[PDB]
Design a binder for this molecule. Structure first.
Ligand SMILES: CCO[C@@H](Cc1ccc(OCc2csc(-c3ccc(Cl)cc3)n2)cc1C)C(=O)O
Lengths: 258, 10
C-alpha cells in the first residue's frame, strides 16, 4: 500500500543520510558557492596538485587516490545495503555477490552528485579537481574519468535528489540478475517492492518530469557499461604497469567479476 | 573475505 511505500522511501533516505557523510545537497551547495566558510581548493595542473597535498609520478598518485576513495565508498555502501529491509536475511554469499556486482555502479551514481561538466569534488568536498587536468594524464590514466563525466552530465540533468537517489541505489543493489546468485526469487521480490517505492517517489517528488521513472531505469543499464569500460582499463594497467597492484579490498571485488 | 567482514559487523 501507498503509506507502506512512503515509509520505505523515508527509511531508505534516513539510512542514506546515516551512511553517506557527503550528500548531493551538500555537494551542490559547495559546487554553486551557496555555503558559508568553505571554498574548495582547485587542482588544475601539476603545481596546483603540489599545493593541495597539505590540505610516485602524477598519474599513479591520482590513481592511488581514487583507490583510497573507492575503498571508503565500498564501506559506506555496505553499511547502506545492510539497512535495506530484507537484505541482511539473504544468504550471505548472495549478499557478497550483490555487493561485488553493485558497488561500482553505486560509486559512479554517487560520483555524479559531486561532479559538473568542469570537474569533481575531492577530499570530502574540500577540493575540486578539473576535468581538464584529469584528461591531461598520460596513457593509460588520462581516459579513466571521461566516461564518468559523460554519464554525470546527462544523469545530473534528471535533477534527482538524495531522497530519489536512496531508492535508486537500493534498486541497483537488489538486482536478481547478478552472476552466481544462489536464490534469485527473494532478491527479485525485494527489488519489486523497491521499484514500486521508486515509482511512487518519482511521481510525487517530480510530478511534471516526463517519463522520469523510465529514464532512471535506463540509467541503471548505462551504469553497467561504465563498469565494463573501467574494468577493461584496469586489465590494461595490470598487464602493462606491472609494478602496481590494487588495494586488497578492490582486488577482492574485481576478482572473477563477470 | 573482507566483504564478509564488512557485511557482518555490528
Ligand atoms: C582508479 C580507481 O577507480 C576506482 C573507482 C573510482 C572512484 C572514484 C573516482 O572518482 C573520484 C576521483 C577522481 S580523481 C580522485 C582523487 C584524486 C586525487 C586524490 Cl589525492 C584523491 C582523489 N578522485 C573514479 C573511479 C574510477 C575503482 O576502480 O575502485
Amino acid at each position: 500500500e501507498s503509506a507502506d511505500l512512503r515509509a520505505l522511501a523515508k527509511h531508505l533516505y534516513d539510512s542514506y543520510i546515516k551512511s553517506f557523510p557527503l550528500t548531493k545537497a551538500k555537494a551542490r551547495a559547495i559546487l554553486t558557492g551557496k555555503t558559508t566558510d568553505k571554498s574548495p581548493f582547485v587542482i588544475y595542473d601539476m603545481n596546483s596538485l603540489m599545493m593541495g597535498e597539505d590540505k610516485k609520478e602524477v598519474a599513479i598518485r591520482i590513481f592511488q587516490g581514487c583507490q583510497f576513495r573507492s575503498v571508503e565508498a565500498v564501506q559506506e555502501i555496505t553499511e547502506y545495503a545492510k539497512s535495506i529491509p530484507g537484505f541482511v536475511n539473504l544468504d550471505l554469499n548472495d549478499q557478497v555477490t550483490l555487493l561485488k556486482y553493485g558497488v561500482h555502479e553505486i560509486i559512479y551514481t554517487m560520483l555524479a552528485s559531486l561532479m559538473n561538466k568542469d570537474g569533481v569534488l575531492i577530499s570530502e568536498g574540500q577540493g575540486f579537481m578539473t576535468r581538464e587536468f584529469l584528461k591531461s594524464l598520460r596513457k593509460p590514466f588520462g581516459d579513466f574519468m571521461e566516461p564518468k563525466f559523460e554519464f554525470a552530465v546527462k544523469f545530473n540533468a534528471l535533477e534527482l535528489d538524495d531522497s530519489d537517489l536512496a531508492i535508486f541505489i537500493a534498486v541497483i543493489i537488489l538486482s536478481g540478475d547478478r552472476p552466481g546468485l544462489l536464490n534469485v526469487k527473494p532478491i527479485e521480490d525485494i527489488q519489486d517492492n523497491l521499484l514500486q517505492a521508486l515509482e511512487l517517489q518519482l511521481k510525487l517528488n517530480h510530478p511534471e518530469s516526463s517519463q522520469l521513472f523510465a529514464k532512471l531505469l535506463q540509467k541503471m543499464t548505462d551504469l553497467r557499461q561504465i563498469v565494463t569500460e573501467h574494468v577493461q582499463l584496469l586489465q590494461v594497467i595490470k598487464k602493462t604497469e606491472t609494478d602496481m597492484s590494487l588495494h586488497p579490498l578492490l582486488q577482492e571485488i574485481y576478482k572473477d567479476l563477470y | 573475505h573482507k566483504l564478509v567482514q564488512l557485511l557482518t559487523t555490528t
